[PDB]
Amino acid sequence: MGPGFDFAQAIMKKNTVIARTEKGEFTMLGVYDRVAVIPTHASVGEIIYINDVETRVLDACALRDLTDTNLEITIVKLDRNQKFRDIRHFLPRCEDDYNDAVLSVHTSKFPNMYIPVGQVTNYGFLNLGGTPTHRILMYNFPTRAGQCGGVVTTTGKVIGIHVGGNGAQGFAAMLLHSYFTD
Ligand SMILES: CN1CCN(C(=O)[C@H]2CCCO2)CC1
Fold this sequence. Notes:
mainly beta, six-stranded antiparallel β-barrel, six-stranded antiparallel beta barrel, binds (4-methylpiperazin-1-yl)[(2R)-oxolan-2-yl]methanone, Protease 3C
């Protein structure tokens, strides 16, 4: 509808796949080469389905901060025959607050879904499903089941992936450039 939705669509159309684990279907953001991200509660194993194709997992790492606190981001390297467009230059370098974000989801239940969530707060600490979690972004939208893994963007930036909600607010795990250096 406007330039926020334009940037979101450009990310969705080239840098997402549908990931299926034994815990459900998730929006999955591809970042570069065969490297993608998914919420850690997806419980990635040795095999995952990517757009309904059986795919070997070459590596999976559940990220934690240097205090050994959950970040709710798992970085997955896929045994896929195709690379993702490299979008690492759209990742923020530091923790920040944002204006005017979009949450974008693509699954069997919610294809081509875009939500203007408005202002994004650097919330920090969240007890997420009973797990102490750091680097949480918060937005005042009543997000629902089916949205985990959804991509949070501003114009110019890919800032997080949706990991939860409390019925009135939604919560995303930050993406930082430093997670994807090699
Ligand atoms: C023609 N304009 C310049 C190229 N753009 C991009 O690279 C998109 C894709 C990912 C997010 O931004 C924007 C459109």
